[PDB]
């Protein structure tokens, strides 16, 4: 019944989070909801506390606290198709916010390989490709973008991908 109590302590934060009310999702309201930080401490060991770390990491990033975001997102442990790669992708995007571009690109490429699907992999591959172009790493960008064209051809991004490949090829010069 520890999981049951943890889940009841979490659901109000899931409502705030969905309404973009990140401060109250993270630190609690004053009317009975304690916030994601206190859920993860009070009910550690439960699935609810593992989830709370993913939610809290996104809260920190939406609030502009990217260092805290990275530390919190790393605490999430999961291996599903959707949430875990998106959380890893969010970590790479926070690295980009901090100027750690090498770490951002490899994290995003990793998130794309972990997701391996049309809904998420192309999002992370595009973001990795744009960072690799900013670094002057044109062949690596072409490889990220070509992966969208080759493996994720049914995705929305594959409709538009050729202009990105061509631009990166033309910058080799």
């Amino acid at each position: 019944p520890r999981e049951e109590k943890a889940q009841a302590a979490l659901f109000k934060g899931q409502e705030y989070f969905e309404q973009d009310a990140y401060e109250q999702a993270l630190n609690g309201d004053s009317i009975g909801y304690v916030g994601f930080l206190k859920v993860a401490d009070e009910y550690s060991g439960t699935k609810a506390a593992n989830l709370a770390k993913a939610y809290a990491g996104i809260c920190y990033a939406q609030l502009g606290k990217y260092d805290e975001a990275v530390k919190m997102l790393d605490g999430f442990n999961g291996g599903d198709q959707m949430v875990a790669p998106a959380i890893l992708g969010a970590t790479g995007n926070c690295y980009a916010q901090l100027g750690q571009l090498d770490k951002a690109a490899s994290t995003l490429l990793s998130a794309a390989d972990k997701a391996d699907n049309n809904s998420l992999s192309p999002i992370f591959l595009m973001q990795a490709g744009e960072i690799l172009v900013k670094q002057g790493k044109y062949d690596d960008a072409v490889n990220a973008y070509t992966k969208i064209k080759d493996k994720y051809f049914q995705s929305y991004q594959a409709m538009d991908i050729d202009k990105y490949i061509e631009q990166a090829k033309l910058m080799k010069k």
Binding site: F11, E18, Y55, G79, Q81, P122, I123, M126, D160, Q167
Partner: protein, 663 residues
């Protein structure tokens, strides 16, 4: 025997029956009607299956992550009353009309039974399970979506791609300038491209290719003449009829029953409405054929009037132990009212409100009206304002007072003889005999396809038929023929299915099976050929450009088939429209975003041709970069692009759908 699986967990035909049961009651109790037809029922079967599959897909992920909708959250949602699913609910406060959680709190205490409209617990139990399933999916989707952040590099790029604008001259040779038959596409190249791109050609569900014949039996000439004769006889009798139209119209089996009441124009068959202005009271509007419902018809306007469509009235009913007391009591009540006693007061004295109500002809238009209902409604329409009447109604009496009349409309009584032109059994048997002779003489797909035309049958075609489609060729009652098609072998011919509304006949030839796995080369030959052709045309054009030693814009414009154009306000973000090519060319902006001013580009392989570009001008929109706003737009874009993630969960969910094997 189970109807399918998702994630290695099966759904038995029993549970599937129960859920489609559940959903039908709910669909009837909300669309008004009390039964659905065969295509509506199929819609219900598919929604139940779709809904089951999506919730199973979400549950396996939610279980892994620990996403749940706890009893506490449900109580919270219920107390709030704002969820869209709690709006068009039965439980509503009597005055507010909004969801009241408190009346919902219902007892577990129900010869101790009394009545059984407390199967309402099963209805609410459905609303509540839909609530938690939908809240679970929504929690899951929102966690994925909100984790799809943007970053400052992607924000700066999106802004740059929008505000940088370029102007460029173009010279191009279109692909249409090369005749297709001059490009040789070897079978070894189609095979090579196929193997290279093989993962793009998956067949996720087995499909089959069929041909079928769909015969519809329609009335012959002798059939139509026999029904024309019956309507002619009924029209002559209708002319000489002067009363008791209800019984006469029933006695000739009209599709349009008569009620001895006045109705608005709209209450009558639309073909009758279309003719009413040309019809005279008391004269039969003689036999006519109506194509839209295949009927021969005649009608007689019995009477026309202008009368109120809305009548206000109050009433008081009188029932007693026997007839003697009922009559004495109703006469006493009638006397009091006519002497000026207050209606409401007197009505309270026999346990009734006695408040005025309204009645419009729309509340009885279309219903079967007879007995006390007809007597009652006739009484209301023939009582003057403020007049009181004591109406005997078989077992009871009703003291009636009309208080007001509004909405005076043109109203009609119309006796309608409507008879459908149906085929005889002789006609049907002729068609069945011809069709069975044809099928038996052509018991293979090869023979059926070769000989259908000479026998007079239209051979229809359907590729990529899936076993979830319910019918062959949209014809009602062909689910057996669909079942047959997915158990047959190529070359087989089915039997003759009688279907439709006892008026269709279907036979099916199976021509091909595309099993789950990869679509074969032949199925995607055309798309592969066209790609290989484009690549070779682009090679030929670029070879011709090099042989011409074209190094300037003018030398490119001088080549065979060249066109030119001036492309203004090109951006990376939006694909350039190129008039000269009648085509959209997104590579124009790719080139322009990194091009040098006044430098002629190398040839570029586009969508409609090979082109060169030379930029001559540049500028910027004056917009200010706002990194937070750009990132918010990109984040929402990411959410939209990932909104189809249920499809990905479906592909990994190893979903099997064997519903067609049973219903």
């Amino acid at each position: 025997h189970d109807v399918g699986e998702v994630n290695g967990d099966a759904l038995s035909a029993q549970e599937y029956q129960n859920l489609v049961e559940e959903y039908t009651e709910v669909i009837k109790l909300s669309r008004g009607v009390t039964a659905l037809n065969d295509e509506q029922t199929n819609q219900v079967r598919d929604e139940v299956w779709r809904s089951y599959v999506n919730n199973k897909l979400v549950e396996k992920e939610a279980k892994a992550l620990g996403l749940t909708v706890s009893a506490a959250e449900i109580q919270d949602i219920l107390k709030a009353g704002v969820h869209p699913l709690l709006q068009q609910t039965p439980f509503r406060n009597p005055q507010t009309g909004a969801f009241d959680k408190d009346m919902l709190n219902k007892f577990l205490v129900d010869a101790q039974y009394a009545e059984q409209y407390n199967n309402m617990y099963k209805y609410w139990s459905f609303i509540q399970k839909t609530l938690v399933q939908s809240r679970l999916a929504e929690k899951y989707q929102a966690l994925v979506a909100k984790a799809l952040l943007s970053n400052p590099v992607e924000a700066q790029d999106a802004f740059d791609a929008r505000v940088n604008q370029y102007d460029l001259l173009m010279a191009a040779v279109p692909y249409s300038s090369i005749v297709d038959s001059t490009i040789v596409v070897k079978e070894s190249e189609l095979k090579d491209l196929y193997n290279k791109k093989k993962e793009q050609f998956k067949q996720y569900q087995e499909s089959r290719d069929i041909k079928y014949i769909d015969v519809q039996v329609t009335a012959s000439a002798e059939d139509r003449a026999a029904i024309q004769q019956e309507v002619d006889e009924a029209t002559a009798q209708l002319a000489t009829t002067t009363d008791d139209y209800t019984s006469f119209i029933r006695s000739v089996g009209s599709e349009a029953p008569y009620v001895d009441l006045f109705y608005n124009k709209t209450a009558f068959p639309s073909d009758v409405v279309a003719r009413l202005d040309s019809a005279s009271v008391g004269s039969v509007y003689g036999p006519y054929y109506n194509g839209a419902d295949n009927t021969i018809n005649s009608f007689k306007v019995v009477a026309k009037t202008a009368a109120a469509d809305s009548i206000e009235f109050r009433q008081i009913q009188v029932f007693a132990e026997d007839a003697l007391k009922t009559k004495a009591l109703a006469d006493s009540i009638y006397t009091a009212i006519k002497g000026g006693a207050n209606f409401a007061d007197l009505a309270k004295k026999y346990g009734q409100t006695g408040e005025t109500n309204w009645m419009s002809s729309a509340q009885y238009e279309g219903a079967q009206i007879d007995g006390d209902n007809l007597k009652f409604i006739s009484a209301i329409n023939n009582t003057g304002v403020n007049e009181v009447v004591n109406l005997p109604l078989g077992q009871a009496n009703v003291i009636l007072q009309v208080t007001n009349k509004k909405a005076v409309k043109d109203k009609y009584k119309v006796a309608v003889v409507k008879r459908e032109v149906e085929f005889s059994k002789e006609t049907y048997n002729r068609a069945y005999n011809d069709f069975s002779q044809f099928i038996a003489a052509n018991p293979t797909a090869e023979k059926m396809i070769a000989n259908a035309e000479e026998a007079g049958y239209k051979l229809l075609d359907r590729r990529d038929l899936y076993s979830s489609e319910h019918t062959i060729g949209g014809v009602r009652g062909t689910k057996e023929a669909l079942r047959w098609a997915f158990s047959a072998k190529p070359g087989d011919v089915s039997g003759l299915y009688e279907c439709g509304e006892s008026d269709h006949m279907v036979a099916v030839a199976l021509v091909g099976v595309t099993p789950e796995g990869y679509r074969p080369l032949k199925a995607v030959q055309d798309q592969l050929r066209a790609e290989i052709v484009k690549d070779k045309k682009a090679e030929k054009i670029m070879a011709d450009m090099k042989a011409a030693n074209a190094t300037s814009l003018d030398q490119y414009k001088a080549m065979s088939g060249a066109v030119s154009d001036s492309l203004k306000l090109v951006t990376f973000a939006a694909p350039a429209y190129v008039s000269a090519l009648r085509s959209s060319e997104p590579l124009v902006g790719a080139y322009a975003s990194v091009a040098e001013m006044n430098k002629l580009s190398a040839p570029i392989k586009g969508n409609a041709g090979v082109f060169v570009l030379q930029m001559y001008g540049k500028d910027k929109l004056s917009d200010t970069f706002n990194a937070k706003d750009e990132e918010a737009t990109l984040a929402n874009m990411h959410a939209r692009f990932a909104s189809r993630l249920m499809n990905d969960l479906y592909l990994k969910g190893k979903v099997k759908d064997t519903r067609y094997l049973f219903f």
